[model samples]
Target: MKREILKHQLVPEHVILNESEAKRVLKELDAHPEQLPKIKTTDPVAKAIGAKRGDIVKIIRKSPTAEEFVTYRLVQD
Candidate 1:
């Protein structure tokens, strides 16, 4: 269940929320705030992720002649 996941894996931890996940959270927040969720920011985990603070993160990798990318944003709500 959504609540379970957010309660266990998401709480008090820094999670890289992808676009879809972020949208889901914003929508839920707009609907409910009493259930305040705890999410983390790379700004604090920059050294772990090898990124810089306040920087939007995008993981880019090359494969053969093509490239792939995954994006995430850090927000606290």
Candidate 2:
């Protein structure tokens, strides 16, 4: 059977942030969305999370030493 890689425990949580949320995050970081890392819209994880171009995806992962580690990425085709 084919595996759903995005659903794997090691994949972490993927969230498509709303416009306001994205704005707030950018403000907090004192940077623009374009300044963040980029993810291809065609990526399996990005597609599985329903992220589209111009969308910001928030990734949350639990680390062995940290309670939670978060990062953001801009989706692109």
Candidate 3:
């Protein structure tokens, strides 16, 4: 899959979701019973997109709000 940069915010690696968009993923979406996509949370990766730890990697979708609404937690060990 291809990654897209957000134009609204100038964060190179961050995806900022509006309030409604966040709610749709937390409340309205169904649980995905498959493998969640993996991405490296490294400086290069983070700098390229401008994302930080604990930031939710929202899988944007489409439907009532979006069909595949999901968020990836920055799992740290």
Candidate 4:
């Protein structure tokens, strides 16, 4: 059976940030997209989530200390 990486329970929530959302997040971080963590387009998770080069992917993961941990990844070739 073919399984999608994004659907697996092991994979955390992921979504592609639109142009506006990406700009807003970068502004809030006070850093350039390149300055943020980088994720390659070839990444299975990134590809599963339909993230393209130059796009930003928002990943939300469980956090025992806090409600939830939020992070962003800049998709690059």
Best by lDDT: 2
In candidate 4, stretches whose alpha carbon ends up further than 4 angstroms from where it belongs are 1-9, 29-31
Q: What's each prediction's TM-score?
A: 0.28, 0.66, 0.34, 0.64
List ranges where model 3 is wrong by over 4 Å. Answer: 1-14, 17-27, 32-35, 43-45, 59-77
The candidate with the higher TM-score, 1 or 3, is: 3
Tens-place lDDT digits, model 1, residues 1-77:
54445333522223444545555664544532224332345334455454343333333333466644333444332
Q: After superposition, how far is residue 34 of candidate 1 from its true place, in Å?
A: 20
Off by over 4 Å in 2: 1-9, 29-31
Ranking by lDDT: 2, 4, 3, 1
**How far does residue 16 in candidate 3 sit from its true spot (Å)?**
2.8
Q: Write the per-residue lDDT of candidate 2 for residues 1-77, one digit (tens) a residue.
A: 46555565567787888757976886676776777778787886467678777788788889787789677787777
Candidate 3 is scored at a TM of: 0.34
lDDT of each: 0.41, 0.75, 0.43, 0.74
lDDT of 2 at 56: 84
For candidate 3, give the lDDT.
Answer: 0.43
How many pairs in model 3 have backbone atoms within 3 A of each other, for residues 3 or more apart or on separate chains, i.e. clashes? 9
Q: What is the lDDT of candidate 4?
A: 0.74
Model 1 spans > 4 angstroms off: 1-11, 31-77
All candidates: CA RMSD in angstroms?
12.4, 3.8, 8.4, 4.4
| Count of clashes, each model | 0, 0, 9, 0
lDDT of 4 by residue, 21-60 (tens): 9868877767667677886788864666777777787778
